[PDB]
Amino acid sequence: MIDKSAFVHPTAIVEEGASIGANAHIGPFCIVGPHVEIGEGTVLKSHVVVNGHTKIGRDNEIYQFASIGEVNQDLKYAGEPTRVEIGDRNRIRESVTIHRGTVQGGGLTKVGSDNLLMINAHIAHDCTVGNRCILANNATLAGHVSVDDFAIIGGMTAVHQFCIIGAHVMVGGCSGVAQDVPPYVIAQGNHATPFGVNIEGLKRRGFSREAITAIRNAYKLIYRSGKTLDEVKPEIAELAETYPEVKAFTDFFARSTRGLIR
Amino acid sequence: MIDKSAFVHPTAIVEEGASIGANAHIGPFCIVGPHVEIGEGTVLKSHVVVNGHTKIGRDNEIYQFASIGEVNQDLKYAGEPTRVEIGDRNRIRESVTIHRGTVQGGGLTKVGSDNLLMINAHIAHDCTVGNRCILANNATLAGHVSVDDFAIIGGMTAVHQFCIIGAHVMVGGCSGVAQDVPPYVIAQGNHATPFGVNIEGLKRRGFSREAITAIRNAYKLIYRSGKTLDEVKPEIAELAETYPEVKAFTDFFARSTRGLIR
């Protein structure tokens, strides 16, 4: 049902069954499917298509020509009732596309809160984007990709299927990410390789001098010590016993399946 | 107000306050904000969104799914009443996005006349595009970028913030421009580097044999003589005393702040 305080433009089409929260705004020429839930205060500027079993949070701003919850591009998808979940206060720009998941991939494409998805950014089926992330113009996430908190993906960069972009990572524009990127790392080029720690990002997010140094030492263990990953893992876990921020590496390794970029 | 000779499709929404010139054409499903000015003979095919304090010239052709004058993507922008100015006879293709400026950047995004902005070209906040330019498919200008007259930016090429693309320059597709490009130069690759003078372009624009040779000599001074830029500047100014076309370099150096690509 549509909340009494929500605004639905006369030219917009909200199908019976859709749930529109208080003070939400559905601009002209928008289409909202019957299985869609739009949270309180969320705004759909105009020309926005939202369908499928999709739940959108509060205070989001979705711009014209964006396509949310739409059928994915996986050739295996056959119309199964999969889903999309989007959090709060996200800024979804013109032409962004966020597709529903596939049964084979888990049936869910998820986006957190406080993210900025710039023009033509693409979030394919079964992706999981965290919070406070930035996908720049034309940034493209292939299916089954994970983008962790605070990560920034440069313009025209494509992340290959199943890859993980660690927390606080910064991927340079015009890049091709074919493997997993540990947290706190700066990567760039096709295929992408590591170029150090995102020090400036960590500074702005409140990390102490000690944590940043610990993180740099962890980085050196992985890419400088020359010791195989399995010999480095226990070393990093050891380091994390004193500097908690380093556990991010540990949690990341447990999820990695594509190997680390090098 | 709307000129009596202008056509506004019944499905289009032109908000009170908008100024539509004589013989202009606002196609179906278009949205024109109250602070917009559309010049004589300008055509909005259909599905075009134009808002903000935006002034558009005469005889422009704006295609479906384009977004003009819209809120920019700068995280610092807070809704201040900034502006966009677009000239005459521009061809703005499907999905092009031209965003309003930021107070911090000068409050204005400007586009000249006779430009061709191809599919999904992006002109970010505070950019200044001259006249007779071509931004190919997916060409992306980050904020505060200047693109001088006759410049051509290849497909999928991104120009980094604050950079200047000199007059008559040709940037190859799939490139990443991280510094300033002197006029008359051909650049390509990520990051972009110089590969000579755009001789064919100069030929087609009426440059004499003498001017082209002078320009090539100026190019050699910058990238071949081996002399530091500051030693070359007075040399080029000297050369310009005889061949005026060479002063373009002088005027360019005075505006450069990102250094020259090399």
Binding site: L116, M118, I134, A136, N137, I152, I153, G154, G155, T157, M170, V171, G172, G173, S175, Q188, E200, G201 | Q73, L75, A124, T140, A142, A158, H160, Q161, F162, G176, A178
Partner: peptide, 12 residues
């Protein structure tokens, strides 16, 4: 300091 998301870098 200046963040350039499209470039994917922190600029100075």
């Amino acid at each position: 300091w200046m963040l350039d998301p499209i470039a994917g870098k922190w600029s100075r």
